[PDB]
């Protein structure tokens, strides 16, 4: 979900600005984030319209 | 007008897209500052050893 | 009101972003650098 | 090979205990060299971490 992903990505940033992680965790967290960012943007531009009558 | 009706009901795709882009700029910039701090800390401890 | 540190930086950011806006400035490039991600950092 | 925390924590002891001057200049070399080897492993971890970042973002 876009809003869940946006909110979840928001928490990735917050930890990185607390500055308490080990290197491996930071890099692991970073790859969690940027990967989640592309997936979110692609899904936004991929959907299309649906309509039905009666 | 009927066009305005669709404007008050629907979201704004371009604004969300500007939202996901901006949060990525913050995420990318955060790592640059995070690495530089750790790199300089190691650099000084290495200088002391020399 | 008593500001917490986080709220203070929030209101300060909103102030400048809302008053000065976008301006044209001139100066000399100093202390250039370009980390891995590709962003440019430098001092005027 | 070690975590970055071990790298700097260990190097902290060597400089701190070596800087004290509590040994002859010719005896501490059993450790002063040990400082260099710790530095190499620490740097190796850090530099490759920077490359690991660029591959993730350099995909476009």
Query: For chain A, how many residues are written?
Result: 54
Q: Phi-psi bin for C4: left (phi > 0), alpha (psi -120 to 50), beta? A: beta
Instruction: Tell me if residue B11 falls in helix, strand or coil.
Output: coil
Q: CA separation (Å) from B33 to A39, B30, D4, D5, D27?
A: 25, 5, 17, 18, 41
Using a CB–CB cut-off of 8 Å, the residues of D that contact A are 3-5, 45-46, 49, 52-53, 56-57
Query: For chain C, how many residues are written?
Result: 44
Q: Are A39 and B20 in contact (CB under 8 A)?
A: no
Q: Are D12 and B45 in contact (CB under 8 A)?
A: yes
What whole-number distance in Å separates Cα of residue A29 and Cα of residue C36?
Answer: 17
What whole-number distance in Å separates Cα of residue A8 and Cα of residue A6?
Answer: 5
By the CB < 8 Å criterion, does B49 face chain D? yes
Instruction: Tell me if residue D45 falls in helix, strand or coil.
Output: helix
Q: Give CA angle at A26 (A25, A32), nearest 5°.
A: 90
What whole-number distance in Å separates Cα of residue D31 and Cα of residue A8?
Answer: 47
What whole-number distance in Å separates Cα of residue B32 and Cα of residue A27?
Answer: 12
Cβ-Cβ contacts under 8 Å, D4 against chain A: 22-23
Least Cα distance to A14 among B16, D49, B26 occurs for B26
Resolution of the coordinates in A? 3.8
Beta strands, E only, A2-54: none
What whole-number distance in Å separates Cα of residue C31 and Cα of residue C26?
Answer: 16
Cα torsion D5, D11, D14, D16 to 10°: value is -80
Q: What residues contact residue B9 under an 8 Å CB cut-off, 6+ apart?
A: none
What whole-number distance in Å separates Cα of residue A25 and Cα of residue A20?
Answer: 10
Partners of A5 in beta bridges: none
By the CB < 8 Å criterion, does B45 face chain D? yes
How many CB atoms lie under 10 A from the CB of residue D47? 11
Q: CA separation (Å) from C34 to A16, C4, C40, D56, D59?
A: 20, 34, 5, 17, 18
Contact state of D51 with C36 under an 8 Å Cβ cutoff: yes
Instruction: Tell me if residue C42 falls in helix, strand or coil.
Output: strand
Interface test with C, best of B26, B28, B30 (most C CBs within 10 A): B28
């Amino acid at each position: 979900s876009f809003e869940k992903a946006l909110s979840e990505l928001e928490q990735i940033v917050t930890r990185l600005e607390s500055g308490d992680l080990p290197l491996e965790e930071a890099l692991n967290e970073f790859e969690r984030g940027v990967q989640l960012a592309r997936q979110g943007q692609a899904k936004l531009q991929q959907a299309e319209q649906r309509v039905q009558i009666l | 007008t009927p066009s305005a009706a669709a404007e008050v009901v629907s979201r704004n795709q371009q604004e969300l897209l500007r939202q996901v882009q901006s949060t990525r700029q913050r995420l990318e910039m955060a790592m640059d500052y995070y690495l530089a701090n750790r790199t300089r800390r190691f650099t000084q401890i290495h200088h002391r050893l020399q | 009101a008593i500001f917490t540190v986080s709220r203070l930086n929030q209101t300060v950011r909103l102030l400048l972003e809302h008053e000065m806006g976008q301006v044209w400035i001139s100066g000399e490039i100093s202390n250039f650098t370009q980390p891995a991600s590709g962003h440019w950092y430098f001092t005027l």
